[PDB]
Amino acid sequence: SWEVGCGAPVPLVTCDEQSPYRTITGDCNNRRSPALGAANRALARWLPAEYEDGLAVPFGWTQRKTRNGFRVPLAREVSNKIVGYLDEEGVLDQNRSLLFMQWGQIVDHDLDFAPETELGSSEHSKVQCEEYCVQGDECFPIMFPKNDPKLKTQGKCMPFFRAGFVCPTPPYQSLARDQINAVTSFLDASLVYGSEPSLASRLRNLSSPLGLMAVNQEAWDHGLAYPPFNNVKPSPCEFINTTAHVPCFQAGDSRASEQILLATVHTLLLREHNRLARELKRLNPHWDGEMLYQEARKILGAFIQIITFRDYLPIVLGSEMQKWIPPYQGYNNSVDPRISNVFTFAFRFGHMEVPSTVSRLDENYQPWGPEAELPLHTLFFNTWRIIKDGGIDPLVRGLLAKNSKLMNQNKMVTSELRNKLFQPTHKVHGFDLAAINLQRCRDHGMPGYNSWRGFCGLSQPKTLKGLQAVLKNKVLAKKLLDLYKTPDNIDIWIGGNAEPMVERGRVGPLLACLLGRQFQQIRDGDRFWWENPGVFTEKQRDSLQKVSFSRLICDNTHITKVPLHAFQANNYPHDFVDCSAVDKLDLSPWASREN
Ligand code: HEM
Ligand SMILES: *[C@@H]1O[C@H](CO)[C@@H](O[C@@H]2O[C@H](CO)[C@@H](O[C@@H]3O[C@H](CO)[C@@H](O)[C@H](O)[C@@H]3O)[C@H](O)[C@H]2NC(C)=O)[C@H](O)[C@H]1NC(C)=O
Ligand SMILES: *[C@@H]1O[C@H](CO)[C@@H](O[C@@H]2O[C@H](CO)[C@@H](O[C@H]3O[C@H](CO)[C@@H](O)[C@H](O)[C@@H]3O)[C@H](O)[C@H]2NC(C)=O)[C@H](O)[C@H]1NC(C)=O
Ligand SMILES: *[C@@H]1O[C@H](CO)[C@@H](O[C@@H]2O[C@H](CO)[C@@H](O[C@H]3O[C@H](CO)[C@@H](O)[C@H](O)[C@@H]3O)[C@H](O)[C@H]2NC(C)=O)[C@H](O)[C@H]1NC(C)=O
Ligand SMILES: *[C@@H]1O[C@H](CO)[C@@H](O[C@@H]2O[C@H](CO)[C@@H](O)[C@H](O)[C@H]2NC(C)=O)[C@H](O)[C@H]1NC(C)=O
Ligand SMILES: [Ca+2]
DSSP, X not given: OOOSSOSOSSOOOOOOSSXXXXXXXXXXSOSSSTTTTOSSEEOBOSSOOOOTTSSSOOTTSOSSOOBTTBOOOOHHHHIIIIIOOSOOTTOEEEEEEHHHXXXXXXXXXXXXXXXXXXXXXXXXXXXXXXXXXOOBXXXXXXXXXTTOTHHHHTOSEXXXXXXXXXXXXXXXXXXOOOBEEOSOSSSSOHHHHOSSHXXXXXXXXXXXXXXXXXXOSSOOBTTBOOOOBOOOSSOHHHHHOTTTOOOOBOOSSGGGGSBHHHHHHHHHHHHHHHHHHHHHHHHOTTOOHHHHHHHHHHHHHHHHHHIXXXXXXXXXXXXXXXXXXXXXXXXXXTSOOSOBXXXXXXXXXXXXXXXXXXXXXXXXSOXXXXXXXXXXXXXXXXXXXXXXXXXXXXXXXXXXXXXXXXOOSSSOSOHHHHTSEEOSSSOSEEEOHHHHHHHHHHHTTOOOHHHHHHHHTOOOOOSHHHHHHHHTOHHHHHHHHHHHSSTTTSOHXXXXXXXXXXXXSSSOHHHHHHHHHHHHHHHHTOTTOTTSBTTBOHHHHXXXXXXXXXXXXXXXSSOXXXXXXXXXXXXXXXXXXXXXXXXXXXXXXXXXXXX
């Protein structure tokens, strides 16, 4: 097979092995195979890639060719018939907050990214894709089926570009096509600190010896910080309201400004880096800026680890967790920490948890002003609503008080995501996230629903009656097969999502498995996982056990009323208490001494 080590990454990183700090790139975690889990390398393959030419060409590319003796259904046709719904009433999750959706997006963004193939600088390859919908090379258009209302308004297709691949980005051929993970595979708060040594520095305040991080100079949220602006024009954030002139935020992750609430938790995280950084110079005045940045970076890492695994995961995987993520037993140097290709489609389960509206509430948890409840589609790359319409305080209260959208077989993805999505480079408010997910499955060369079913050790449904038993839904299983013709061909995203949810959790049998395995691999294969003896001192761990997302809000906002359990559905005022009832993170054990 091979090549054994293709591609060019950040080709200049040799290990210190004696440093107690993670590399920005994620290198040097593993002593034996040191590029394992790093950034800018092939997503791991749990199962062999599936292309029609067996090498690189997606299923759906050529019209004459077929998948298992059937034509693959159009990306959007799958959506129009199965994914969409009209009536938004009763789709709310009665036992999970908007934060349950929100944190999903934070971890994931920490864990993976597969950068698009917008290669070029002054180009007509972008034009022949968008204007003419000409398939070929790095352009893979999402066509519109007969009687799509988007034909009248938008055109003949939705522009779609293939994902970036290993070795170089001009076509080529040898092994099957593997897609690139632009971020580090460890749960290491890279959304904040970056995955490139080049960018990791740009985000830092290297003007003072305090290990602080660059903050906005133009705007201020009641004396509290905002992220810096991305002064790289043209920007998507400016385009949406030209009169405002407000550009996107800049963090260690490109997707920080995609939606308004994701930029909000980005503000909270950046805020507590500086708070830890400041409290550490209170306690350790002799420390240089480097120790400060790094020591703060280490606590925040541990922060995102404890919240993800103690608070988030148990309510996602549910009864299935102990089956897949048993209790911790130490760092296994034989476990592959890399994020697999399929995982980048498993974690997308959350797209069906995004509700139609984002609300802004006041101190009394009452609707804030005339335009309190906004449509979500108006909030893609919307930063002017943060900076010039209340700050983050109203949006944070919304997260804690308002419900998440519950997954439903008859009501899947909101039309605000499935019909009105804004994509950063393009101009209109009209892409389909359901269709975009469905061709990326095909682009990445995913094997079908059944391979993955079997991979996890679950009955591989082959008949109409078979699929029924698994999906516990006769009408959905029939629509699925009328389009896919066989359950072997169902795209992993929709197939995995269609399944009913496990007990006490928010995902079904197949997804619990795929998600379950990854999260254990990235816990067990991480040399810097907080609990692993050596990383944090015995005392340091005891304080880290006390962190809560509620405390992140209290110490970095002028919200004073917070629920204790921030991922479950809480009502005002009964479930809300004072910030004083919420346990503080004691940073005393970090106090190093001299004589
Ligand atoms: C309104 C909120 C959200 C918006 C607007 C949004 C939008 C997007 C878009 C446009 C993509 C690119 C898809 C592609 O081209 O393949 C994406 C990727 C992704 N999203 Fe979301 N998303 C949201 C929330 C979430 C949440 C809450 C989660 C997790 C629970 C999530 C999980 C993911 C994952 C895993 C990817 C692929 C990551 C990778 O690059 O490998 N998203 N999102
Ligand atoms: C483009 O961005 C600007 C903000 O930079 C938006 O303009 C603002 O629009 C609202 C009206 O919807 C104005 O608020 C008004 O004043 C007070 C609150 O400050 C309130 O009592 C009034 O009832 C009213 O809501 C605000 O002054 C105005 N800013 C100015 C002077 O430009 C604009 O709506 C955005 N448009 C788009 C295309 O989204
Ligand atoms: C809504 O979700 C809440 C968050 O999980 C959940 O709170 C959970 O309540 C039970 C208390 O019993 C705990 O789960 C345990 O339940 C039984 C024990 O009687 C066992 O079978 C389970 O294995 C499990 O240990 C959770 O600890 C607790 N969650 C947390 C972390 O606070 C509510 O119960 C849910 N509300 C509804 C709709 O019932
Ligand atoms: C990099 O770090 C610098 C030092 O920590 C920081 O400069 C400080 O900025 C704050 C906030 O803008 C200023 O605090 C306040 O100054 C007066 C107080 O009398 C107020 O009237 C202002 O409203 C302001 O809030 C400090 O004056 C300033 N400190 C120093 C040492 O000059 C930079 O802003 C940081 N730069 C970046 C890009 O992150
Ligand atoms: C560390 O984890 C690895 C991977 O799960 C374990 O390696 C397995 O060892 C079994 C024997 O029990 C072998 O049959 C397999 O070859 C290994 N499995 C895999 C997935 O490769 C190992 O048991 C663990 N080691 C320690 C010390 O905990
Ligand atoms: Ca990471």
